[PDB]
């Protein structure tokens, strides 16, 4: 009975470690996320055109609405298995709280917190937290701030005061979020335009846009 007393002491130390991690993640109070809706330029996802929401979903988390914070498939491909690996929920937790570090223990507590926001918030609210708290360069942390700043367009579908964000622009912004900081929307390199091209194929292949919109976007991309 030697191999069971060691398999046990190990199985418990991990469960003990995992238990502590929970308490560390607690909290980390997800109620805090509502503070994002106070931003001067906050626009909720439900008030954005569908291709805009889809520029981000197809690029970052194509099964966004299906999961409960953790995407197994996307996280296996992501496990250094030759567009991952964090779900939009995980990125929301990372951006709001762990604005600083990226350690293994932070990655485990990040999982606990993510589960908690999925529990507390609906998918639309979570998508709104995401789009309103990511870095798009030039000190822009909101999609609308970004859209205004780079293009002078808006992402509020209801808006009538400002021109509407194009398919290309939605794809530039979505591509920028996890692009290397070197990618500069003010002066796009070939690697950047290649990246958005991919974002566009995905939008088309997932039917957030049709062939026509896509071709028009690609065309605009190449001037």
Asked if 91 is part of the footprint of Mg ion (rule: CB under 5 A), the reply reads: no
Site string for Mg ion, 13-52 (x = CB under 5 A): ----------------------------------------
| Least distance from Mg ion to the Cβ atom of residue 42, Å | 26
Asked if 166 is part of the footprint of Mg ion (rule: CB under 5 A), the reply reads: no
How many other β-carbons are positioned within 10 Å of the β-carbon of residue 24? 15
Cα–Cα distance between 12 and 139 in angstroms, integer? Answer: 46
Counting residues that bind Mg ion (by CB under 5 A) gives: 3
217: helix, strand or coil: helix
| Least distance from Mg ion to the Cβ atom of residue 81, Å | 13
Surface-to-core class of residue 168, CB atoms within 10 Å of its CB (0-12 exposed, 13-18 middle, 19+ buried) = buried
| Least distance from Mg ion to the Cβ atom of residue 67, Å | 8
| Least distance from Mg ion to the Cβ atom of residue 62, Å | 12
Asked if 87 is part of the footprint of Mg ion (rule: CB under 5 A), the reply reads: yes
Cα–Cα distance between 192 and 190 in angstroms, integer? Answer: 5
For Mg ion, the closer CB: 71 or 125: 71
Closest residue to Mg ion, based on beta-carbon distance: 75
| Least distance from Mg ion to the Cβ atom of residue 175, Å | 20
Q: Which of residues 45-84 bind Mg ion (CB under 5 A)?
A: 71, 75
Residue 164's DSSP bridge partners are 154
| Least distance from Mg ion to the Cβ atom of residue 31, Å | 23
Close Cβ partners of 73 (under 8 Å, ≥ 6 residues apart): 63
Q: Which of residues 116-145 bind Mg ion (CB under 5 A)?
A: none
205-215 residues labelled b (16+ CB within 10 A) or e (exposed): eeebbeeebbe
For the chain, the straight-line distance linking the first and the last C-alpha, in angstroms and rounded, comes to 73
Helices 50-60 + 88-96 axis angle, to 10: 90
For Mg ion, the closer CB: 91 or 133: 91
Q: What are phi and psi of 154, to 5 degrees?
A: -120, 160
For Mg ion, the closer CB: 174 or 209: 174
Q: Mark the segment that binds Mg ion (CB under 5 A) among 43-51, 85-93, 100-108, 129-137.
A: 85-93
Question: Residues interacting with Mg ion, by CB under 5 A?
Answer: 71, 75, 87
């Amino acid at each position: 009975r030697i191999l069971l007393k060691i398999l046990l002491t190990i199985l418990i130390i991990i469960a003990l470690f995992i238990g502590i991690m929970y308490f560390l993640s607690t909290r980390d109070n997800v109620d805090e996320l509502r503070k994002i809706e106070n931003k001067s330029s906050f626009v909720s996802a439900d008030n954005m055109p569908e291709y805009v929401k889809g520029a981000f979903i197809s690029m970052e988390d194509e099964r966004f609405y299906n999961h409960h914070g953790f995407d197994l498939k996307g996280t296996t491909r992501a496990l250094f298995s030759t567009q991952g690996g964090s779900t939009i929920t995980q990125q929301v937790v990372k951006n709001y709280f762990y604005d600083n570090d990226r350690s293994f223990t932070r990655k485990v507590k990040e999982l606990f917190v993510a589960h908690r926001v999925e529990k507390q918030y609906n998918k639309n609210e979570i998508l709104s937290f995401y789009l309103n708290n990511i870095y798009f360069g030039d000190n822009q942390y909101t999609l609308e701030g970004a859209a205004n700043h780079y293009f002078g367009t808006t992402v509020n579908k209801n808006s009538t005061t400002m021109s509407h964000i194009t398919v290309l622009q939605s794809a530039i912004l979505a591509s920028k979020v996890n692009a290397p900081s070197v990618y500069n929307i003010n002066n796009m390199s070939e690697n950047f335009t290649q990246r958005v091209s991919t974002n566009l194929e995905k939008m088309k292949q997932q039917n957030y846009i049709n062939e026509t919109q896509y071709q028009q976007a690609m065309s605009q991309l190449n001037r």
